[PDB]
Amino acid sequence: ATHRLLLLGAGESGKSTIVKQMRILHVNGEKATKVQDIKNNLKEAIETIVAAMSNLVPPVELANPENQFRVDYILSVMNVPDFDFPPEFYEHAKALWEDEGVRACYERSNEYQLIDCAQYFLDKIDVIKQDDYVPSDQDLLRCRVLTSGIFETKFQVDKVNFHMFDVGGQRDERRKWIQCFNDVTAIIFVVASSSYNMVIREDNQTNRLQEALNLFKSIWNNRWLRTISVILFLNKQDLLAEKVLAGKSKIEDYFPEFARYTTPEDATPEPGEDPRVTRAKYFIRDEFLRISTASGDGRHYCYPHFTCAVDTENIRRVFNDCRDIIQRM
Template sequence: MVIGCCTLNNISEDAKTRSDANKQIEKLIEKEKKNFKSTHRLLLLGAGESGKSTIVKQMRILHIDGFSEREKKEKIDAIRKNLRDAICVSFLKLPYVCQSISGAMGSLRPPVELELTENKRLRDYMLETASKPDFDYPLEFFTYCSKLWKDGGIQETFERSNEYQLIDCAKYFLDKALEVGAPNYIPSEQDILRCRVLTSGIFETKFSVDKVNFHMFDVGGQREERRKWIQCFNDVTAIIFVAACSSYNMVLREDPSQNRVKESLELLASIWNNRWLRNISVILFLNKQDLLTEKVLAGKSKIEVYFPHYATYQAPADTLAEYRHENSEVVRARFFFRDEFLKVTSNNNGGRHYCYPHLTCAVDTENIRRVFNDCRDIIQRMHLRQCGDDVLLFDIIVRRLTCTFDISIGFFKLPREAA
């Protein structure tokens, strides 16, 4: 009889323990549901140097408080480093291959000579003195930058920057070298937007628009950074994929054999066709439209050299009519790249996701304000669909609580036991 009572007590205690555990799990799931429903989570993806971090900076300017005086001053060193990287520092340590304008002159085929022989002393200073790790940016450095930048040979080398690796902001900061070097220099918002700093890791930015909460995740786009992307996939509302259309004539820093736009196309394909992302729609930012326009109008780097089928491409007639006040060749180039990326997303492969393209210029605050306002309705619809689909919502919550992930470069996979 005593044994029977002990057995019943043990069963009762086990049942109570299981019941308590179930209640805790249910509470946790309800809490996660509430948190999920109240926040839109946006994941910024794209190849390196596509403009993802600049989009995040724009969210700070538009929807937070911008940058404080202290934060602006903290950016001075990074801006001056951008200027130095542009004019004098060559960084050839793999996987990053970066050359300055001065450093590239002799390596181009055919090589470029300085227009004024008296500027050789300034170029030597850049390559020998200013390239030292402990360089402290004396005032003469900025004076020399300004003088060298006006040299015809330096300008010619800059015009051939697709033949080597040069940061996009080179011209912007070289044009204002004397201002950047002034003792009382305080960066403007545009200076901060233009400043290039390599993103490594995952950065979260939180902001609200009309009482709606957004969490935006920015991750590095270089190949070795992509294994970190999967950590952000569990509960994302939408993916914002950023592609630099102006880089059609450039190669990757980490792989000089790969065209940058073709890398972006392959990367979007790997995301779009991934089985774990078939219910996540993509907002496509076709970025750096300002630089694309400059290249097309300059006429020196023909798109058909890198994408032969561009030679026979015709923009939709309604598009040409809508943009009739703009240069027709620029419009044709814009929509060629739009259509190239939309081809990648033309097959849903059984998924319930869509691609929404937008032409963007990440350094143009008004453009990003307008585009993001357009995107908010799309994001809201995606979020409501996720929250209204009990099966999908439960799957998201369970994956959020229990799944771990691994990733191989550019392609995504779950551990074997979860697959």
């Protein structure tokens, strides 16, 4: 028994991360190559923050005017091709990240394209700088890299086989998806549930979640996917929790229907989770369920999951639910 699974979703949704978790969980020089990529993540993350400070409205100010010189150092090196990563970089990088103004700009990151792994790596510069550095499993999970094309990852669980297919979520890339529509066990559709306050990259205008919603309706209602069921991976629940509890950007100020929404009776909140988060996480779910409910006609079904792709302690648990559901197909 083999099962061909297609992973779908917008850009930076989780797709790649999840393939990674399958390798952590159900598979086995190899990591020295990935170190460079993490450093790039760190570079692209710090520049992006400072570069954005002066272009925001209102513009942001450094708490320490001394730092202006590092700000100058970073922008000077921003374009450099095969960047050398001298120990100055890390020094200046760290210093900036200590500056409360640089951070205050980072709070307003919903207003410019900033990778998810920023705050993670910017909190651990001193570890990455060492020449004897070797990335932790969570470091490899967090390393963001764009997927161009389609990548087949084969693994097995209990002699049962799985072929997993990774695709680009970016608009230009979606044109390749079709190639995996025939002979497919089930769709795993990934959503960055936390991205409710930020616009997409491709046009810098269209809201990320709304893009995700429209992309789901496209897939759910596709002409070549009326048989095929979709496992819905509402993902980035940690980041979602953060925002709701942080209270900086309200959801109803982006999705006004939220004000006219009370929490479901069938809700099963995780032990001692905040009623506010509860309300929020299930509302994003129901938004997706309306699409799946509307059409379908018992030929395919929607199975939601609350997911944290960077938490293997939640991937195993939910991937287990998916092994279960795969019983009939």
